[model samples]
Target chain A: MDNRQFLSLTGVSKVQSFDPKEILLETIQGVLSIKGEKLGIKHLDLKAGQVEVEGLIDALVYPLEHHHHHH
Target chain B: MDNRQFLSLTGVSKVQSFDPKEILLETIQGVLSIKGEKLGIKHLDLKAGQVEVEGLIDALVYPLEHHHHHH
Candidate 1:
């Protein structure tokens, strides 16, 4: 979950990163907690470095406005 | 949480936003969820638009790497 919490604790700027793995973990934990269980436990094991959370994490990373197509 | 999920659904690029408010909610939700809660819900009332999270949410928003000083 390298979506690493915003790195500025100095109260200077307000911007964060968009690492897919981070978002995945957050979403899964949030969604599952809603279902039951407090841990954002995932079927994908961290020892194996694998993640398989439902829904699109990347979708929340890059916005539609910033997207571009290359031909 | 205008950190609004990345608008991009497909895999072309990976990038996300860091609205102070969004980051705040996400962090609060994540931390509390660990304790036992699903919603990345926030306490900062929209009507009042006030936030009072424990840790600093502004750090992650803007990284120190790209950070600039304007005096």
Candidate 2:
């Protein structure tokens, strides 16, 4: 990550949503959420399960893994 | 900048050279050199002066700006 300005990954099945400050992706590994500024899609090849993103990346979260169960 | 796997930039006037390990670009700002592994051009819009690259980025250099003259 060069000063959190760009990012790339593989095994991405779908892009749930995207905006300047957030991007949600469903990957083979899990549901991934990326947060930052001026976020944009640089490359996306679903057939190859690859994606490249550009922006000021601040956080990477796996929401499914962080869920809580209450009775 | 997600783990040095992706990169994007603007103001590129020309692409001097490209390979799996190196990419040389001439930008409005100056001559820029990027070095890494498995590098590939993800997106390029010369008309818009924008470009995106994917790889394991190891270094970013501006050779012309780093020159030294000795007598």
Candidate 3:
């Protein structure tokens, strides 16, 4: 399950980029992106593999699982 | 139109709830929510209908366009 403004997962390796309007992260689920305003990092544990964000969350998107193309 | 940890919108009317892991906001697009660790408000202008959030930015969500649902 998910929320209007939150997600939980593991294998989040690192944060690639960050800003009030955008954020990029690496997780087991795939490359994760968040978009919105007034966003902030509430807590994060690199060792624990946990993260929490706050603010007016507007969207959550995951990478497409593209199938292999045969020539 | 978005990023890993950021979302931009124009109709953000108000913020209803806040915490390290959860945030709820009102926008013209609909009710928006954000969730993640170490989240905080970077900037907010109620009159301008603008807000900025910084953090891991794990999720963003908007309400449906159909009939009102209560919980």
TM-score of each: 0.16, 0.43, 0.44
| TM-score of chain A in every predicted structure | 0.21, 0.72, 0.68
Q: Give lDDT: candidate 3, residue B31.
A: 66
Question: In model 1, what is the error at residue B15, expressed in angstroms?
Answer: 21
Return the lDDT, model 1, position A12: 15
State the lDDT at B40 in candidate 2.
72
Return the top candidate by TM-score: 3
Summarize candidate 3's per-residue lDDT along B1-71 as a digit string, tens digits. Answer: 12334334445567788775667877655666666657665444565565656555555555644564464
| Residue-by-residue lDDT tens digits, candidate 2, A15-38 | 788777888877643566766677
Q: Write down the lDDT that model 3 would get.
A: 0.57
Model 1 TM-score, all chains together? 0.16
Ranking by lDDT: 2, 3, 1
* Tens-digit lDDT track of model 1 for A1-71: 33312210111121122233343223211211111112123443343222323332211211112234352
Q: Please, what are the lDDT tens digits per residue for candidate 2 over residues B1-71?
A: 13434456655678898876778877654555666567876545575566677666544554432244452
Greater lDDT among 2 and 3 belongs to 2
Superior by TM-score: candidate 1 or candidate 2? 2
TM-score of chain B of each: 0.20, 0.74, 0.69
RMSD of each: 16.4, 13.3, 13.1
